[PDB]
Structure 1
Amino acid sequence: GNYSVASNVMVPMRDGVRLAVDLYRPDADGPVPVLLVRNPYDKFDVFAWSTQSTNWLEFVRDGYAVVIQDTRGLFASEGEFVPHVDDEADAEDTLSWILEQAWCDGNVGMFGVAYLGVTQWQAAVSGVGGLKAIAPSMASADLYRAPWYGPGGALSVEALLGWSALIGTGLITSRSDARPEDAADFVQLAAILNDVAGAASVTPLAEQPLLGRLIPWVIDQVVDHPDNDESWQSISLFERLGGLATPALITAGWYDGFVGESLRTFVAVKDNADARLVVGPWSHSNLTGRNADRKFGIAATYPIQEATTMHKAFFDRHLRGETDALAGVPKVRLFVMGIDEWRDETDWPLPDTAYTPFYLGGSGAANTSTGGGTLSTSISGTESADTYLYDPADPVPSLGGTLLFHNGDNGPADQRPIHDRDDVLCYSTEVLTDPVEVTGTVSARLFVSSSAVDTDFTAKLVDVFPDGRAIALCDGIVRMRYRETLVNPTLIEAGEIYEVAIDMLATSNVFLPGHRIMVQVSSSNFPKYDRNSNTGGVIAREQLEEMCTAVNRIHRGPEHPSHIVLPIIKR
């Protein structure tokens, strides 16, 4: 079909501030269903994000109108920009405006990735009857849990500094008349992006002259609020998701920074409305399926046309009343790593998931990959413990995983470069003779003790290949002061043994014959997470010099059954 495009149509918000939108309307008679996208990266720049989403022009050619809007305070829109705080109201007023237009038939939907996904959850809680469906990709409904902090209570510092530098560069390269400093700033912002770990290594972390100037929010909201307090609660949508009845087509990536939260949104809305889930082996910046030491095959490449077809079927069902539009479409579609194949599922978590404990054990010290650390479904008979020194000045480098900006294009990273570290404990199963599928949420329960009043403990699931590659799958961290709650932290007593849980997000991997299941335990993973100072103080306000090293210990045996819980699937 044919269509037209109207640029910079100004939409008034409740406070009088006008946001700019571009209207892609089909050349048809009568009102049509409409799809909305709220974008902070310039509505004009469609190529920048569309390749990670859908060939949505197909929607317009098929009769849908598409509205792309500049969020408040950015590019063509008026007002002041502050992340997240105005999106709920602005989305509500925008949806109301769309519903009032002559070309809207009363059915509105949304789609988009990341920030363009978070804004959909913020729109969904408005209660606007006209919003019939959303499709949040690689998104979150709880900004503290993803992407700024996490279930463990540690700051995702590389995510914060990287995104902030990107926003800053955008704020500058768009100004209404360049400034004298602009040139210099753009240089500094680039220096941050080329070495995020370096930018995150400065102490006190809270001191950000550049970023703090270009976007105060970086410190005023994120850095200054390490507890999941009221400031975070205010923009979290998660608790309100259970009361909604809005269909949601959710997409996630196993190595994507928002994966944990993306999956949780599916679980939160699947009972009250038509929810769909698609999870590929992608990281935020790498949807190719190709990584430095791991290739998932061409079938793993983000299937943009298939995604477009699925989104159209989803919108046809919920916005155009086509009751059989989703016939044959699975509820859940996962890329199962190892066998490296897409597979349909009827639900997530998968039905028949056997949450199986794999206990830490072994003779001697489990320090380093050449230690004697073992993993077994049987409880260890010997009461032992592995000890190591965690020094904030020398944290374990982040390698792959869900990194967003700091080397965030190699999720399934080979871990061998850090296997020689004494602060990296390794526990592996024997070489497998039969495949073992692990698909679902993953967590660990460790009995630990520290010489400090606070510290961190990390756990990483790894697939060890016959050729030696130790490929990262999923990982988590627990900042001890938040061991029981992210809201009201309390310190620990040196030497006392605590049983703590580490949320390791999720994965889908078949450990094939010849492989080993391995878990890496430590007390740091920088800059994925900022370093714990081991002092019990305000971490972001401490000087490296005033920080302490900590002698940490992992207890294992009959009385302290430390283990990782794997979601075993047997078919």
Structure 2
Amino acid sequence: VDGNYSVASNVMVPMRDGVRLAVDLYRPDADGPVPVLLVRNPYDKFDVFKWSTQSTNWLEFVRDGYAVVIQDTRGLFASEGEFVPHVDDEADAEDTLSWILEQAWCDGNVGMFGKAYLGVTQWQAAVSGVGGLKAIAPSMASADLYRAPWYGPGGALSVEALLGWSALIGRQLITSRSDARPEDAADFVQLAAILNDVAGAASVTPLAEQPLLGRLIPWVIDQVVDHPDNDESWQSISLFERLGGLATPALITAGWYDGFVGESLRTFVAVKDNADARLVVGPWSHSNLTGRNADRKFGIAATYPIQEATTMHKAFFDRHLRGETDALAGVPKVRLFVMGIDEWRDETDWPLPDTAYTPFYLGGSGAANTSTGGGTLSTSISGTESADTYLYDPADPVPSLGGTLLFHNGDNGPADQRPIHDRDDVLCYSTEVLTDPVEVTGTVSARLFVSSSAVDTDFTAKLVDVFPDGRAIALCDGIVRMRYRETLVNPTLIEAGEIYEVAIDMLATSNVFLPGHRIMVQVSSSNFPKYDRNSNTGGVIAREQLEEMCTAVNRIHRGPEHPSHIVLPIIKR
């Protein structure tokens, strides 16, 4: 009977090392083998409601004759072994795909889908070289775990991401225990205390001293906190350099305020030339897919469109797993939610073909400190050589507000920035009020001429849409940790007082700045706890006591000889 299926629970699948991973099998009631979809999940295969609303109505796949396999990753829930994030998923996926292809009900075509960690596991499957894997659909995910979600292209630790995710894993571990331990109740209460105040949890120094999280999951320190450089421990789990050699179609989803957005987009660029890649980018954060935020509404069309996503995935799998050559007719290559006009729009490529990478130069009379300073943005080079100066004190960092936060207030991406506009360490530069719309859609970076009294420090840049009513809405932002200014791999310190030209990777955005709005940039030296705070010492930042840290007098240089600017991807239509 078409539309009918059965579900077998806890089918144990043996890995190469003998450890068995548990899967559930959703198999259509049909004669003959069927195409198969695999989901590798660290959050309990049984608990399909926890993630499915952020993905697809995938039971439609099963009713339409796909088999679906959902697997507990190694060491979690019904699976045997020991859980350490990322390090076993390449081999475990290869073995799992091999097992699936052997089964009587598999017709030789496997795909995957899933979000975040369930999207990472698809890139880790895709590098296995198993021919039966015909397509993947990694949503809001990354193929380079240093660059997202644990560190970033700027070389700063995403501390709220680390601590928030570790705490959720700890609670998961405790809730899943066969026999409760005497300390479970208290551990559970204190993991909730981390999740209720992630910035406070991230404020304890030394950062590397994590008595609770380091005990429940030592990888927190042993891998992430102890490896601030993009070293072999990170490269060993990175998939990115191998993506260019694949020929695997990929349906890639991202969100403009999602923690993985920079790496999600880079996977699309890395695979688009060798197979059928697809891009969908909505205005979502990792945990807020509604399109509604405290001070910014994108309209109901911005709500994660799960039914259209289901239709698109099925069309995608029909083309690549069933060989239905016309299945993707009418489906665009790229589909972006363009903010400002707040509309979905089809494109033929990402980056957009006619992108004009345009410098907007920092300038203005007087000091650019606070939103009532003199800072300007202009497409013309500033005529007068000036400099803006502020004190970055690690004990008083600029609080994170919106952006791509994951667990610390991570449901308000397009956050109003006015609560930090008064800060002397927040330099503001903006255009005049616009009389014509300006569309900025693409990757965004800054090039700043900076100097410090310290031998290391951070510099941040944040792009902002100023509304007529005064709302200053965050778009995209980035950081550069000065020791990593040239390389994330082999850092060197800087000379106090010397001027450096540094790039700040500000990820990406799609926004039409409408008439009556302004384009604004904030520059500073902290963004906490989105990023951990630089100690301004050149030390091992995560091993320093707050007392051991130094303040830094930092300076942005701007003028004809130091033309600091933000590079905006301008689209004109």
- CA deviations on 1:431-471 (whole Å, 9 max, x unpaired) are 00000000000000000000000000000000000000000
Name the CA distance, whole Å, in 1 between partners of 2:421 and 2:249: 45
Match of 2:286 among 284, 287, 294: 284
Name the CA distance, whole Å, in 1 between partners of 2:498 and 2:144: 33
Aligned to 1:57: 59
Aligned to 1:301: 303
Task: Indicate the larger mover: 328-337 or 171-180.
Answer: 171-180
Name the CA distance, whole Å, in 2 between partners of 1:151 and 1:186: 33
Name the CA distance, whole Å, in 2 between partners of 1:187 and 1:210: 11
Aligned to 2:170: 168
- CA deviations on 1:408-451 (whole Å, 9 max, x unpaired) are 00000000000000000000000000000000000000000000
Aligned to 1:517: 519
- CA deviations on 1:127-154 (whole Å, 9 max, x unpaired) are 0000000000000000000000000000
Aligned to 1:408: 410
Name the CA distance, whole Å, in 2 between partners of 1:177 and 1:33: 39
Name the CA distance, whole Å, in 1 between partners of 2:190 and 2:432: 49
Secondary structure in 2 matching 1:72 = coil
Deviation at 1:540, TM superposition (A): 0.1
Deviation at 1:248, TM superposition (A): 0.1
- CA deviations on 1:160-200 (whole Å, 9 max, x unpaired) are 00000000000110112110000010011000000000000
Name the CA distance, whole Å, in 2 between partners of 1:169 and 1:122: 26
Deviation at 1:476, TM superposition (A): 0.1
Name the CA distance, whole Å, in 1 between partners of 2:186 and 2:330: 55
Secondary structure in 2 matching 1:43 = coil
Aligned to 1:17: 19
Name the CA distance, whole Å, in 1 between partners of 2:512 and 2:27: 46
Aligned to 1:333: 335
Deviation at 1:406, TM superposition (A): 0.1
Name the CA distance, whole Å, in 2 between partners of 1:388 and 1:114: 38
Secondary structure in 2 matching 1:166 = helix
- CA deviations on 1:397-416 (whole Å, 9 max, x unpaired) are 00000000000000000000
Secondary structure in 1 matching 2:96 = helix
Name the CA distance, whole Å, in 2 between partners of 1:538 and 1:293: 38
Deviation at 1:387, TM superposition (A): 0.1
Secondary structure in 2 matching 1:475 = strand
Secondary structure in 1 matching 2:137 = strand
- CA deviations on 1:337-385 (whole Å, 9 max, x unpaired) are 0000000000000000000000000000000000000000000000000
Name the CA distance, whole Å, in 2 between partners of 1:175 and 1:292: 37
Match of 1:80 among 79, 82, 92: 82
Name the CA distance, whole Å, in 2 between partners of 1:530 and 1:69: 34
Query: Which aligned pairs between 1:62-461 and structure 2 lie closer than 5 A?
Result: 62-461=64-463
Runs of 4+ aligned structure 1 residues displaced above 2 Å come to none
- CA deviations on 1:196-248 (whole Å, 9 max, x unpaired) are 00000000000000000000000000000000000000000000000000000
RMSD: 0.2
Secondary structure in 1 matching 2:136 = strand
Mind listing any 5+ residue stretches in structure 2 that lack a counterpart? none
Name the CA distance, whole Å, in 2 between partners of 1:549 and 1:364: 24
Aligned to 2:481: 479
Name the CA distance, whole Å, in 2 between partners of 1:170 and 1:38: 16
Secondary structure in 2 matching 1:500 = strand
Name the CA distance, whole Å, in 2 between partners of 1:418 and 1:7: 52
Name the CA distance, whole Å, in 1 between partners of 2:350 and 2:454: 39
Deviation at 1:570, TM superposition (A): 0.3
- CA deviations on 1:240-284 (whole Å, 9 max, x unpaired) are 000000000000000000000000000000000000000000000
Name the CA distance, whole Å, in 2 between partners of 1:425 and 1:202: 27
Aligned to 1:547: 549
Deviation at 1:113, TM superposition (A): 0.2
Name the CA distance, whole Å, in 1 between partners of 2:497 and 2:300: 51
Name the CA distance, whole Å, in 1 between partners of 2:177 and 2:15: 22
Name the CA distance, whole Å, in 1 between partners of 2:163 and 2:362: 36
Name the CA distance, whole Å, in 2 between partners of 1:338 and 1:90: 43
Name the CA distance, whole Å, in 2 between partners of 1:531 and 1:428: 26
**2:495 matched to 1:493?**
yes
Name the CA distance, whole Å, in 1 between partners of 2:448 and 2:373: 19
Name the CA distance, whole Å, in 1 between partners of 2:358 and 2:71: 47
Deviation at 1:42, TM superposition (A): 0.2
- CA deviations on 1:451-499 (whole Å, 9 max, x unpaired) are 0000000000000000000000000000000000000000000000000
TM-score, reference length from structure 2: 1.00
Name the CA distance, whole Å, in 2 between partners of 1:217 and 1:376: 46
Percent identical pairs in the alignment equals: 99
Name the CA distance, whole Å, in 1 between partners of 2:45 and 2:466: 44
Aligned length: 571
Task: Indicate the larger mover: 214-223 or 169-178.
Answer: 169-178
Name the CA distance, whole Å, in 2 between partners of 1:428 and 1:328: 40
Name the CA distance, whole Å, in 2 between partners of 1:407 and 1:184: 24
- CA deviations on 1:531-550 (whole Å, 9 max, x unpaired) are 00000000000000010000
Name the CA distance, whole Å, in 2 between partners of 1:119 and 1:8: 20
Deviation at 1:33, TM superposition (A): 0.1
Name the CA distance, whole Å, in 1 between partners of 2:287 and 2:522: 25
- CA deviations on 1:523-562 (whole Å, 9 max, x unpaired) are 0000000000000000000000010000000000000000
Name the CA distance, whole Å, in 2 between partners of 1:192 and 1:546: 24
Deviation at 1:10, TM superposition (A): 0.1
Name the CA distance, whole Å, in 1 between partners of 2:134 and 2:287: 30
Name the CA distance, whole Å, in 2 between partners of 1:328 and 1:419: 46
Secondary structure in 2 matching 1:117 = helix
- CA deviations on 1:273-301 (whole Å, 9 max, x unpaired) are 00000000000000000000000000000
Secondary structure in 2 matching 1:209 = coil
Name the CA distance, whole Å, in 2 between partners of 1:393 and 1:186: 29
Name the CA distance, whole Å, in 1 between partners of 2:207 and 2:331: 48
Secondary structure in 1 matching 2:10 = strand
Name the CA distance, whole Å, in 2 between partners of 1:283 and 1:183: 31
Name the CA distance, whole Å, in 1 between partners of 2:380 and 2:475: 23
Secondary structure in 2 matching 1:268 = helix
